[PDB]
Design a protein around this ligand. Sequence first.
Ligand SMILES: C=C(C)[C@@H]1CCC(C)=C[C@H]1c1c(O)cc(O)cc1CCCCC
Length: 140
Amino acid sequence: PVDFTGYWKMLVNENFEEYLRALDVNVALRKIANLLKPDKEIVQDGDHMIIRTLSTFRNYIMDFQVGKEFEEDLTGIDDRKCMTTVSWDGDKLQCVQKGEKEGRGWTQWIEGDELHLEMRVEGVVCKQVFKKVQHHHHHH
Ligand SMILES: C=C(C)[C@@H]1CCC(C)=C[C@H]1c1c(O)cc(O)cc1CCCCC
């Protein structure tokens, strides 16, 4: 049984600016956003999952039930909202973000001490890897 609970620090973030360009994020904000190295704080509580992407620039909080479609407010990212469903696919977590953009979603999984996150839109792929960490810090 896969359990994503933990605190995770960004190690790599590959091709994020092109992913943001495919979302039509303005160039100045793409530059700002790709300098950020947010942590992830995840609590998996039965089928209720909370994924907190944490940085001093901004926190983005996902709070959902696996298998239940919900309205995801991404307006601070790319001025859009999606109808999002997160589901198990073997040992991976699959997210489909239905909306104006084609093929928008992500896939998350664990390898050893690494949290792997692949995000996609319009055929453009960004890959992030985080390392599991144990020193915790307070966030709001
Ligand atoms: C909430 C944030 C820290 C920022 C907010 C601004 C943008 C354009 C992207 C987010 C971002 C970022 O700059 C780096 C990331 O690794 C992840 C995310 C969250 C949104 C991901 C989907 C675009």
